[PDB]
């Protein structure tokens, strides 16, 4: 049995946030909790929020037992891009993309036999 939370349309760049997701993958939820608080990146916040919403979803929904949990799977996909004009010298005008992330934490019960 396994539980999952997915944040969608998070306004952040995937490359940036995908980096801290790497940081906690296959970790017991208790270390994963520890790391993200003391990891210095903006995307630590957002990921911890998903981790949690998936911890809750474990015990409260799928009958999981919190102290047995670790991170089975996790990843961030790329939602649609916010495109804004950025005006430039000699009247040029580029377009910057404010990118968007779909964050996914998947939880599992450590074998705990």
């Amino acid at each position: 049995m396994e539980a999952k939370a997915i944040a969608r349309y998070v306004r952040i760049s995937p490359r940036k946030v995908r980096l801290v997701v790497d940081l906690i993958r296959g970790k017991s939820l208790e270390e994963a909790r520890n790391i993200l608080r003391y990891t210095n990146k903006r995307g630590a916040y957002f990921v911890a929020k998903v981790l949690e919403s998936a911890a809750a979803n474990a015990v409260n929904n799928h009958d999981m037992l919190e102290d047995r949990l670790y991170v089975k799977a996790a990843y961030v996909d790329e939602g649609p891009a916010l495109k804004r004009v950025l005006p430039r010298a000699r009247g040029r005008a580029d377009i910057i993309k404010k990118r968007t992330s779909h964050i996914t934490v998947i939880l599992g019960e450590k074998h705990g036999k």
Binding site: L19, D22, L23, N34, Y38
Partner: protein
């Protein structure tokens, strides 16, 4: 200056090769001498900090 430019779009292989150093490393962490939780060393705990002086108060 004549404004240099990349000559060939760089390949997936080569950019991801570029990135092979870019992985983060987890924060180095020690158990706090009193409280249940974890703290990074040579620091005062977010919660109930120290002994020899007045710590920031979660006490």
């Amino acid at each position: 200056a004549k404004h240099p430019v990349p000559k060939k779009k760089t390949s997936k292989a080569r950019r991801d090769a570029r990135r092979s150093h870019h992985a983060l490393t987890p924060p180095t962490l020690v158990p706090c001498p009193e409280c249940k939780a974890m703290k990074p060393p040579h620091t005062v705990c977010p919660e109930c900090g120290y002994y020899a002086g007045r710590k920031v108060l979660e006490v």
